Write the structure tokens for this entry.
Amino acid sequence: ELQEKLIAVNRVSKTVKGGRIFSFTALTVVGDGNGRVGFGYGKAREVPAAIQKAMEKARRNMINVALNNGTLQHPVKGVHTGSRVFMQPASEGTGIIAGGAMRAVLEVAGVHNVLAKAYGSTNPINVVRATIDGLENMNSPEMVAAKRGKSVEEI
Amino acid sequence: KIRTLQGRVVSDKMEKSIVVAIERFVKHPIYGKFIKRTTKLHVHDENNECGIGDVVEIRECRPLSKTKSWTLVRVVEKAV
Amino acid sequence: ATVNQLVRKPRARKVAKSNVPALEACPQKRGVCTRVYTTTPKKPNSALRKVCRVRLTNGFEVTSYIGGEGHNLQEHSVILIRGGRVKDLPGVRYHTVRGALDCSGVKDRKQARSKYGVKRPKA
Amino acid sequence: DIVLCGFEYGRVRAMRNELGQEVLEAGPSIPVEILGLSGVPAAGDEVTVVRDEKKAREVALYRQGKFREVKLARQQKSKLENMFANMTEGEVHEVNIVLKADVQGSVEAISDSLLKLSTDEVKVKIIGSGVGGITETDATLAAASNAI
Amino acid sequence: AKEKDTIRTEGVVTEALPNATFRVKLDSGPEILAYISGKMRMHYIRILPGDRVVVEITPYDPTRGRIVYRK
Amino acid sequence: ARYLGPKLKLSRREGTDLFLKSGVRAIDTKCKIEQAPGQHGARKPRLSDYGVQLREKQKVRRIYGVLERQFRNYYKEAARLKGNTGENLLALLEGRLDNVVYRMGFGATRAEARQLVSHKAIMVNGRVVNIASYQVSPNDVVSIREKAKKQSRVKAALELAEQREKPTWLEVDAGKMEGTFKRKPERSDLSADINEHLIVELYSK
Amino acid sequence: MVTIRLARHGAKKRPFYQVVVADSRNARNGRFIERVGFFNPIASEKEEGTRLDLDRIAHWVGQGATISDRVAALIKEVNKAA
Amino acid sequence: SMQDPIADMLTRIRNGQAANKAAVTMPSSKLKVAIANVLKEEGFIEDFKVEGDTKPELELTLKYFQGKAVVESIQRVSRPGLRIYKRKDELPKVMAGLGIAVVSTSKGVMTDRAARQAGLGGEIICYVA
RNA sequence: UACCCGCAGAAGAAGCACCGGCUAACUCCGUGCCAGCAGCCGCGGUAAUACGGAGGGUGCAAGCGUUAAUCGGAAUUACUGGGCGUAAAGCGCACGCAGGCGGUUUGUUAAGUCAGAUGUGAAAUCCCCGGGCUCAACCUGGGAACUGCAUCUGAUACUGG
RNA sequence: UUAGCUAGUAGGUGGGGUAACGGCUCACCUAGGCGACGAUCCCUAGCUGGUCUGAGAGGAUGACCAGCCACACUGGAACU
């Protein structure tokens, strides 16, 4: 039932006496379709070993986001290295309109209706990093009520 | 129904006229800062009772000269 | 940065400079062939590329590519030019429209004919 | 009625016969000046009317393609005919002329007589024979290369 | 397709211009800008300023030619 | 304006039966159904994310006989409409007259049904409708007109129809050759190996 | 003077008129003062086809507005309908 | 110089909070005291006091939960360099209502929620979540 | 004229670009740093899915491509929504007029700000629910919207006097 | 990479003038009036409803429809 998505595969290279050593990298996300999302990143000489190492990482290192009927609480900004990220809770019917890197994160997360956009570097590893943290710092109508010490209508 | 303006006297030199400045704050259309704007009006002062620096209440009336379409209603504060 | 600063000097978008000024926002332009010659291209390529110098109806004089294999063009040939640079030919920023005005179509083309001014062969 | 003359096509706007400014109908006998054609046709040729103009558009453009193909053909031959990068002797000095005559019949006819006076020593050639009057691109044509 | 109006006439390297470029004077008539053929450059084959060489000339531009035969 | 070429090619490229022939035959006895058309059909497409989205949209289009322009306009309308866009797209397709004519069994194929429509053999509410994309509404009654009622295509078409699963939202009287579009089909009425959200994704990017 | 008349909108072969009060000199489909009815000559007549705010029409007449031959007819027709 | 003492207040909170400080103290003012009131009433701080008469020092008792600061973010909105005013129907809400905006109205300082319910707009002093 | 009925026969009605990655679509033959391609990277010296032809395929379809042109993606003039140690960017340094900003209390004022009421914000367009042409484009009823301006009357926490 | 501009100029009195207020005009008198919140000078341009694009804020734009203005070969003039 966990949902897992392959976001990007890439070839890097290391140089030695004999020449270049080629390897691969894999960036993935797993999610429970109901408010939990992890991302993983693995390296290996062959692609399958890399796509597999990443899922393994993605399964742990997983976090919770305070969803709201399949959509977000409030607009949110996320940032990590080059990537400035922005997300909005859209009305019902829209679905996920977003770049590939973000769509995969939001899909597996369970965010059903959102407007998203990535600014600056669309480098996938940092875009997803920035989205996860955005969702993670996203606070909930109940916690702000708890924080402020009042269960007014706003609860 | 007495529409009116309030401002201060920047020039009282002219015979039976005065220059009044109306200042107001306005939101900047693009950058949101509140900016001072001034509107200078040539106003009629029969009897020349308005001194420079005075704060005066003025009203709009028919043309009195090429540039005067306002006249004095009364002085509010004077000689700061 | 300051709001105050922008209030004194607004954001001012840069005006895009064109890559085909001789066209003056026209889709093609007409012109007479001034010189018709070949030239060699830039690193790492190597060839004898067909180009022509063309004086346009608006006075501009530019160099234009003559694409395709084979052409029957010479001085005083009246041709039609369109936008489109030739990358390994610096200075060359226009293409000649094969099969318009005095410029003939490419001989014996079967694929991509319309980009080389070639009628559909009876068959 | 749509009329097609040579590679030129178009609808007739008006009809003129000799002194008569307007004629409604014209028979096989009496000649009538035709008007409303797209451009000045050849000095002479076979003219045929058609039912619709749209059907006659492709035909007219087809005749242009052949006339243009032979134009570039005769252009390649004359230049390649010398089989050398220059002239073998000193006759390279030539004179250029620019001609535009009001009537289409003359430009083809007198040019033939204008090529009769040509000699080996000095070569004369016509450039951009016009259908009539004068124009900007014509004066520009004489500006690039010195010509009368 | 590749037309066939190419030629193979010979000549002698005259100038030693920059970037594998030469003045190569055709035994035939004149000399042309002559650039070193890819093949030839790939197989190195330096080319002194005074060698008998083969040229590939496109009628399109007699003014230019490619050096085919190394020496 | 219509795809006129070989049909089983389309099924073969999309990897599924698209019902472009009557169904009298096991499709595998008419073509190599599980292999794409062409020299390199045996080749496998290691297929990009864009690729799967494209092919799914093609699949639906090829089922209903719709070319790109009209189908895009169908998406636009589905989007504008209230409720889930993906489901709205399929409601709009499934409401087409050529389609409904096919589902009541008057035509062996949507292609055949479309010909029935174009050739003035179909009436809606006793009124002649001859444009394929006519949107049919709840309670409408579409019928074979009297003169087209003795066409043998129609009898055969109704026989095959009787052997397909019978659609819920249509009430068909085979004798009268009339039928009633009771209601818009739900999503649950339509095949579940259609991935509308992929088509929705293709048209939002 | 001020007149009450039909400004012809709708499409080619499918006329649809907007009844309007206006300065008679302005173009037919141009500047008007007040819109006061409409007239569909192509209405199926199964439902509506001709609607006039008779209260405002009369008000304008009371102030001297004239009335088209065609609007004068519509008004007699609509007065007959109910 | 010290031209925005409210930003200063926000920041002293933010920094002492980040520094897991039990309390923070600052020169007092009615306007600070009005904001401290809203914070306390909405449960973002424990309590507060002002001490002295001629040079009043205001003191805020901060609040912690899971070895975490109750105050997650605290930012100045309107400011001396750019005043921000909103109408009743334009009042922002923070975190979709989970946080609050402090608004200053003709009827004194209150939350976006309060001002909304009382048909008012005002100067948007800050956001808190 | 729309529209309806009748007659003849599949009969009169399919092209355009693309298939190296970005990008849906691969092979053979020809050529050999040539002829040529090329939006960007970049293809071409003997196995070229990149040139040119072919077969096959992909995408559009009475159009299809190329060129031109605005905005988008471009958070790449950043109000919303960016930056200046080493990447573009702190004036060599200080004083200082105008300007911007300004600690804390009370009273006052009520310009900024906030509230309400009233008028105006043409129609068409956009959007919503309907109606009419066989459908659609198109035409059309009613609404909502015109986020704006102005006058009056209030509120006085914040800014200004 | 334009910082100063202005003699009917700014105002006052009175006569004349217009359908009507008015330096609109004339005489006399006062010496003002504009300007860094951009005057003056230079370049460009009909304005709007709206149009295209953009989630929006914006950006670009002002054919077709409608509203206002201006022009009618060029410069000037008044007559009805």
User: Anything to note?
Assistant: Residues 20 and 35 of chain G are 5 Å apart (CA to CA).
